[PDB]
Design an enzyme around this catalytic site. Structure first.
Site, PDB file in Angstrom:
ATOM      1  N   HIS A  44     -56.989   5.362   9.273  1.00 54.32           N
ATOM      2  CA  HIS A  44     -56.263   5.495  10.174  1.00 54.32           C
ATOM      3  C   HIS A  44     -54.539   5.440  10.599  1.00 54.32           C
ATOM      4  O   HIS A  44     -54.120   5.895  12.048  1.00 54.32           O
ATOM      5  CB  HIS A  44     -56.272   3.960  10.792  1.00 54.32           C
ATOM      6  CG  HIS A  44     -55.681   3.495  13.009  1.00 54.32           C
ATOM      7  ND1 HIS A  44     -56.072   2.395  13.123  1.00 54.32           N
ATOM      8  CD2 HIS A  44     -55.968   3.967  13.445  1.00 54.32           C
ATOM      9  CE1 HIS A  44     -55.589   1.964  14.411  1.00 54.32           C
ATOM     10  NE2 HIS A  44     -56.043   3.731  14.297  1.00 54.32           N
ATOM     11  N   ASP A  93     -61.935   2.851   5.855  1.00 50.33           N
ATOM     12  CA  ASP A  93     -59.931   2.899   5.751  1.00 50.33           C
ATOM     13  C   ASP A  93     -59.387   3.406   5.081  1.00 50.33           C
ATOM     14  O   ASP A  93     -58.522   1.695   4.468  1.00 50.33           O
ATOM     15  CB  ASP A  93     -59.980   1.663   7.090  1.00 50.33           C
ATOM     16  CG  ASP A  93     -58.684   2.277   7.606  1.00 50.33           C
ATOM     17  OD1 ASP A  93     -57.735   3.475   6.955  1.00 50.33           O
ATOM     18  OD2 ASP A  93     -57.943   1.091   8.339  1.00 50.33           O
ATOM     19  N   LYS A 160     -69.066 -14.282  10.532  1.00 50.78           N
ATOM     20  CA  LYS A 160     -69.056 -14.914  12.003  1.00 50.78           C
ATOM     21  C   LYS A 160     -68.483 -14.767  12.594  1.00 50.78           C
ATOM     22  O   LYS A 160     -68.194 -15.419  14.124  1.00 50.78           O
ATOM     23  CB  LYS A 160     -69.393 -16.017  11.229  1.00 50.78           C
ATOM     24  CG  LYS A 160     -70.929 -16.576  10.443  1.00 50.78           C
ATOM     25  CD  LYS A 160     -71.132 -18.122   9.503  1.00 50.78           C
ATOM     26  CE  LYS A 160     -72.158 -18.334   8.526  1.00 50.78           C
ATOM     27  NZ  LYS A 160     -72.166 -19.234   8.288  1.00 50.78           N
ATOM     28  N   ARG A 161     -66.766 -14.489  12.020  1.00 53.47           N
ATOM     29  CA  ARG A 161     -65.980 -14.417  13.015  1.00 53.47           C
ATOM     30  C   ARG A 161     -65.841 -12.946  13.701  1.00 53.47           C
ATOM     31  O   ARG A 161     -65.163 -12.576  15.451  1.00 53.47           O
ATOM     32  CB  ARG A 161     -64.327 -14.902  13.001  1.00 53.47           C
ATOM     33  CG  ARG A 161     -64.265 -15.867  11.488  1.00 53.47           C
ATOM     34  CD  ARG A 161     -64.589 -16.785  12.475  1.00 53.47           C
ATOM     35  NE  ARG A 161     -64.667 -18.201  11.050  1.00 53.47           N
ATOM     36  CZ  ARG A 161     -64.938 -19.000  11.594  1.00 53.47           C
ATOM     37  NH1 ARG A 161     -65.680 -20.159  12.759  1.00 53.47           N
ATOM     38  NH2 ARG A 161     -64.767 -20.409  10.373  1.00 53.47           N
ATOM     39  N   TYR A 162     -66.429 -11.936  13.667  1.00 50.22           N
ATOM     40  CA  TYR A 162     -66.161 -10.343  13.981  1.00 50.22           C
ATOM     41  C   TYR A 162     -67.869 -10.148  14.199  1.00 50.22           C
ATOM     42  O   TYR A 162     -68.198  -9.448  13.976  1.00 50.22           O
ATOM     43  CB  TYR A 162     -65.538  -9.678  13.036  1.00 50.22           C
ATOM     44  CG  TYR A 162     -64.488 -10.188  13.015  1.00 50.22           C
ATOM     45  CD1 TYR A 162     -62.870  -9.906  14.489  1.00 50.22           C
ATOM     46  CD2 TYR A 162     -63.310 -10.737  11.894  1.00 50.22           C
ATOM     47  CE1 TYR A 162     -62.345 -10.213  14.197  1.00 50.22           C
ATOM     48  CE2 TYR A 162     -62.043 -10.722  11.463  1.00 50.22           C
ATOM     49  CZ  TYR A 162     -61.311 -10.449  13.383  1.00 50.22           C
ATOM     50  OH  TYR A 162     -60.472 -10.617  12.655  1.00 50.22           O
ATOM     51  N   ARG A 163     -68.305 -10.795  15.113  1.00 51.06           N
ATOM     52  CA  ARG A 163     -70.050 -10.768  15.413  1.00 51.06           C
ATOM     53  C   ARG A 163     -70.612  -9.523  16.343  1.00 51.06           C
ATOM     54  O   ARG A 163     -70.904  -8.886  16.358  1.00 51.06           O
ATOM     55  CB  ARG A 163     -70.648 -11.786  16.404  1.00 51.06           C
ATOM     56  CG  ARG A 163     -70.878 -12.940  15.088  1.00 51.06           C
ATOM     57  CD  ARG A 163     -71.391 -14.362  15.235  1.00 51.06           C
ATOM     58  NE  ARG A 163     -71.835 -14.811  17.032  1.00 51.06           N
ATOM     59  CZ  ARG A 163     -72.699 -14.687  17.801  1.00 51.06           C
ATOM     60  NH1 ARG A 163     -74.113 -14.627  16.619  1.00 51.06           N
ATOM     61  NH2 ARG A 163     -72.681 -14.989  19.326  1.00 51.06           N
ATOM     62  N   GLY A 186     -48.341  -2.481  12.075  1.00 45.71           N
ATOM     63  CA  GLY A 186     -47.504  -1.447  11.284  1.00 45.71           C
ATOM     64  C   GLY A 186     -47.316  -2.044   9.696  1.00 45.71           C
ATOM     65  O   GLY A 186     -46.041  -1.567   9.239  1.00 45.71           O
ATOM     66  N   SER A 188     -50.261  -1.821   8.676  1.00 45.84           N
ATOM     67  CA  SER A 188     -51.660  -1.324   8.073  1.00 45.84           C
ATOM     68  C   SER A 188     -51.017  -0.683   6.802  1.00 45.84           C
ATOM     69  O   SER A 188     -49.872   0.315   7.289  1.00 45.84           O
ATOM     70  CB  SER A 188     -52.562  -0.411   8.618  1.00 45.84           C
ATOM     71  OG  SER A 188     -51.430   0.068   9.954  1.00 45.84           O
ATOM     72  N   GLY A 189     -51.811  -0.035   5.991  1.00 44.51           N
ATOM     73  CA  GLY A 189     -52.043   1.330   5.187  1.00 44.51           C
ATOM     74  C   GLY A 189     -51.080   0.057   3.905  1.00 44.51           C
ATOM     75  O   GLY A 189     -51.405   1.107   2.268  1.00 44.51           O
TER      76      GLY A 189
END
Ligand SMILES: Nc1ccc(-c2cnn([C@H](CC3CC3)c3ccc(-c4c(-n5cnnn5)ccc(Cl)c4F)c[n+]3[O-])c2)c(F)n1
Length: 236
Positions: A44, A93, A160-163, A186, A188-189
């Site tokens: 990303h 990713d 279950k948190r990210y349906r 800032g 990420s990666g």
């Protein structure tokens, strides 16, 4: 990093800060040293990046303010993005940066091992996320590298948190039920680093989440162990 604390020089020597220089120089993403010529980071990160020419890799950095016009950095020879990457939330990713030359390892710039063959069923209880990112959703890049200890959650709880997303075995989630510690903009990666038998392993790549450090919304990381074959293929 939300709810973290400052690191000290030398504490996370595999952590790098990847800078872009277009249209101006700024921290872009974190990354991890996995070989003398190889950084592992998030695909990303290169969404807006016209080519490797504008990237600079800085290692051995504690404070962003250490970087000046004569600070040495590594050029990027190649960006290797996973061929199935489409967007962070749909997985894959992961990216390798092949550097123009070999890092000579030092106390301040060291490799982190990949998750080891035969450790597929280790329960990692000592995991940390590091970075220069925001301390809250609307914030600023931090000068001093921050750290936070965060517990892994099962993929079953994470789904279950990210349906509205497909949480697959190629992702690993981490966070507290009550929130309060997480990656943020800032970060990420960079690495999700877990210590097992006193050896650090690069278990996750900081990737995405809903808000930062919200209750019952764990951060989502690329599950590095599931890309070990891909890394070995690309680096050989
Ligand atoms: N000045 C300035 C301003 C902005 C940025 C900037 C903005 N977004 N990002 C990245 C994505 C960009 C690099 C492609 C990003 C995306 C998501 C996450 C993230 C979250 N978050 C959820 N909501 N926010 N964070 C939660 C958990 C986990 Cl686990 C996460 F990974 C972290 N990051 O870094 C960098 C910057 F780099 N500098």
């Amino acid at each position: 990093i939300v709810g973290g604390t400052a690191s000290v020089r030398g504490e996370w020597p595999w952590q790098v800060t990847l800078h872009t220089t277009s249209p101006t120089q700024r921290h872009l993403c974190g990354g991890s040293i996995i070989g003398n010529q190889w950084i592992l980071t998030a695909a990303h990160c290169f969404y807006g990046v016209e080519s490797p020419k504008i990237l600079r890799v800085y290692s051995g950095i504690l404070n962003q303010s250490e970087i000046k016009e004569d600070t040495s950095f590594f050029g990027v020879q190649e960006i290797i993005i996973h061929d199935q990457y489409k967007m962070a939330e749909s997985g894959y990713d992961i990216a390798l940066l092949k550097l123009e030359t070999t890092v000579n390892y030092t106390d301040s710039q060291r490799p982190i091992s990949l998750p080891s063959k035969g450790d597929r069923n280790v329960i990692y209880t000592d995991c940390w996320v590091t970075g220069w990112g925001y301390r809250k959703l609307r914030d600023k890049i931090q000068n001093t590298l921050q750290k936070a200890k965060i517990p892994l959650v099962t993929n079953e709880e994470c789904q279950k948190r990210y349906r509205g997303h497909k949480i697959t075995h190629k992702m690993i989630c981490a966070g507290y039920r009550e929130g309060g510690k997480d990656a943020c903009k800032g970060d990420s990666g960079g690495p999700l680093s877990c210590k097992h038998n006193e050896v650090w392993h690069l278990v996750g790549i900081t990737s995405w989440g809903e808000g930062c450090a919200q209750r019952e919304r764990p951060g989502v990381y690329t599950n590095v162990v599931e890309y070990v074959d891909w890394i070995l293929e690309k680096t050989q």
